[PDB]
């Protein structure tokens, strides 16, 4: 019986959960817009993939507190990103990327939703902004000071003058989780019970879609069987998902089940209609409008190169060539212990753009989901730790 895989102060499983020994790497890839003026004149966008920009992660748990006679545990998961120049295609503090002006699109979308409408319209009218802007990779990723945000900031101090895809996400966590250890049962090991105090979400339509299912995805319950389905809640993705068995794999000298994210997760279906806000009206198979949880910005999640998506999402942006092996999302789990031996968590950030008559910033741009940057967050078990695990 494997009941030593339980988060108790004394077991080695707890120490690995507290301080993950395996290094995790996130790699950023950007889409450099080659014809901005022609896009504003209503022509088909043309982009170039640029990457990787590889960062090593520093993971740990903090504010660790037990409870309920040892059945529950609460903590926060801090995550930092240390840059690796030699594992990267270039220096991000020099390498420039030309892409959409996300701050102006954000505040344009705010104004259309009547949030600081007069102030935004006034500033935009006085200070002309460009729809396409060029910044360094370090700026786009970890923040830069924007004009319009700075002007709004003087009127509304709560509004940040700086914008970045991962702004202030270095050396920080993503809410206060409370997990469930495997004391009551091994099946509900590292299972999330609440997040930021609440037992479920409240920005999707159906109660079904707002449920917090499964684990964070850093580990799974022991003794996994081929037939079952594993639920994951990635906070950044703003919904629970699930992964199904694909095929058999061996990592080092260890057995592993290859579990992937299936097409059903972002499919245009009734099960996923609840995610399509407001009136159950969806953009199409293979995307997720996450504007509600990204503070009103017109941000659309997808898989890299619109993998597992409607063909028209690929035809809209010249430069998207999706294949399985490069863009799928998979995880190799040791069935016995439920430990991730290898994985590639991959997702893409897009921006919803459309022509506006009230705005000449938009020109005559087409209505489309415009890709900005996607990543590969990956892990791989090394020989020393694998051989350590192999013994048990
Ligand atoms: C992704 O995802 C995301 C999320 O999820 C999303 O998002 C979304 O989006 C959408 C888009 O569309 C949106 O929707 C929109 O919204 C907007 C906004 O809203 C808001 O606001 C408003 C306004 O307010 C203001 O005003 C008023 C009056 O007017 C007042 O009352 C107030 O107070 C304010 O005022 C202020 O300010 C101003 C400035 O100027 C000044 O002046 C003054 O003094 C003051 O200060 C409002 O209205 C709203 O409200 C609502 O809601 C709430 C909640 O809480 C409630 O409570 C209320 O009651 C309401 O509700 C109700 O009503 C409404 C009506 O409006 C309705 O809607 C409902 O159902 C109910 O019944 C808010 O707050 C808006 O604006 C819009 O609306 C529009 O559109 C629609 C369509 O859908 C319709 O339905 C409506 O009706 C409208 O329409 C109209 O208008 C327009 C413009 O102008 C036009 O064009 C048309 O034609 C029409 O017109 C007509 O009618 C009218 C009546 O209405 C009249 O007046 C005239 O004459 C004509 O006849 C819409 O709705 C949303 O919101 C969002 N959400 C979020 C969360 O974000 C997105 O989308 C996605 N994406 C993708 C791509 O997919
Ligand atoms: C994180 O995620 C990214 C992907 O999103 C990974 O990066 C990719 O890594 C794979 C390998 O793991 C790379 O694949 C290799 O690409 C090489 C270049 O291919 C070019 O040329 C061919 C024609 O020759 C074109 O078809 C293609 O479009 C490219 O323009 C290939 O030479 C390699 O081929 C070898 O493997 C294939 C397997 O299918 C064999 O069939 C071949 O015979 C050959 O042996 C290979 O396909 C891919 O290019 C990478 N892309 C990017 C953007 O980096 C990361 O590796 C991943 N994980 C980690 C941990 O980093
Ligand atoms: C993504 O696309 C964007 C836009 O196409 C691209 O930005 C551009 O990069 C080029 C270089 O690739 C920049 O051109 C340089 O401008 C600087 C500043 O004035 C000059 O110092 C440079 O002059 C030297 O260039 C060569 C040596 O580096 C020599 O041939 C020459 O004699 C000079 O010594 C050079 O002209 C250009 O400024 C930007 N454009 C914008 C709008 O920012 C970006 O590089 C692409 N990103 C990636 C990762 O490829
Ligand atoms: C969070 O977890 C719950 C429970 O695991 C998920 O809800 C379940 O979703 C399944 C989808 O297969 C529902 O199955 C249904 O079966 C009937 C026939 O019996 C079929 O006609 C339907 O089309 C559907 O497939 C099931 O009812 C439902 N169970 C419960 C208790 O809600 C939910 O999807 C998960 N949410 C997220 C966001 O991951
Ligand atoms: C995120 O924060 C971490 C932790 O401070 C940074 O990692 C350090 O970077 C310094 C640069 O001065 C280096 O000396 C070390 O590689 C790191 N220190 C430690 C203790 O790990 C990381 O660079 C930050 N990332 C970004 C993008 O700013
Ligand atoms: C996603 O699926 C829905 C439901 O099938 C589509 O809505 C249907 O569209 C067809 C024609 O394309 C109509 O005949 C039906 O009457 C529609 N049914 C409902 C309930 O709306 C919707 O068009 C699809 N969305 C996309 C972007 O392809
Ligand atoms: C766990 O180990 C021992 C318990 O006696 C103690 O030294 C340490 O402070 C404990 N830490 C946590 C986070 O429980
Ligand atoms: C998890 O543990 C067991 C096994 O599934 C189950 O009986 C219990 O209700 C679950 N607890 C929670 C909080 O989900
Ligand atoms: Na409304
Ligand atoms: Na316009």
Residue numbers in the entry: 37 to 428
What do the authors report?
Human LIMP-2 luminal domain containing residues 28–431 was produced by stable expression in HEK293S (GnTI−) cells and crystallized in two space groups, C2221 and C2, at pH 6.5. X-ray diffraction data were collected at the Diamond Light Source, and structures of both crystal forms were determined using the molecular replacement method based on the model of LIMP-2 at lower pH9 and refined at 2.8 Å resolution. The electron density maps for both space groups are of good quality with only 11 terminal residues disordered with 29 and 30 glycosidic units well ordered in the two space groups. The most surprising observation is that we can identify from the well-defined electron density that the sugar attached to N325 is P-Man9GlcNAc2, the first time this sugar, which bears a terminal M6P, has been seen in a protein structure. In the C2221 crystal, the sugars are also stabilized by interaction with residues from a symmetry-related molecule that pack directly at the origin of the three arms of the glycan, forming a network of hydrogen bonds, although this destabilizes the distal phosphate group. A well-defined ion (likely Na+) bridges the O2 atom of the β-mannose to O4 of the terminal D2 mannose (glycan nomenclature is defined in Supplementary Fig. 1a). Although our two structures at pH 6.5 are almost identical to each other (root mean squared deviation=0.3 Å for all Cα atoms), they differ significantly from the pH 5.5 structures (root mean squared deviation=0.5–0.6 Å), with the largest difference occurring in the helical bundle of domain II, which includes exactly the region (residues 150–167) identified as the β-GCase binding site. In contrast, at pH 6.5, the helical bundle is very well defined and similar in both space groups. At higher pH, the α4–α5 linker (residues 151–152) folds towards α7, such that α5 tilts about 20° towards α4 and α7, making the bundle more compact and further stabilized by the C-terminal cap of α4 formed by His150 and Arg153. At lower pH, H150 and R153 move away, decapping the α4 C terminus and triggering a cascade of structural change in the helical bundle that leads to the dissociation of β-GCase from LIMP-2.
Lysosomal integral membrane protein 2 (LIMP-2) is encoded by gene SCARB2, and is also known as scavenger receptor class B member 2 (SCARB2; refs 1, 2). It has N- and C-terminal transmembrane helices (being a type III membrane protein) and a heavily glycosylated 400 residue luminal domain (bearing nine potential N-linked glycosylation sites). The most notable function of LIMP-2 is that it serves as a lysosomal sorting receptor for β-glucocerebrosidase (β-GCase), deficiency of which causes Gaucher disease, a lysosomal storage disease in which glucocerebrosides accumulate. LIMP-2 binds to β-GCase in a pH-dependent manner, and dissociation occurs in acidic late endosomal/lysosomal compartments.
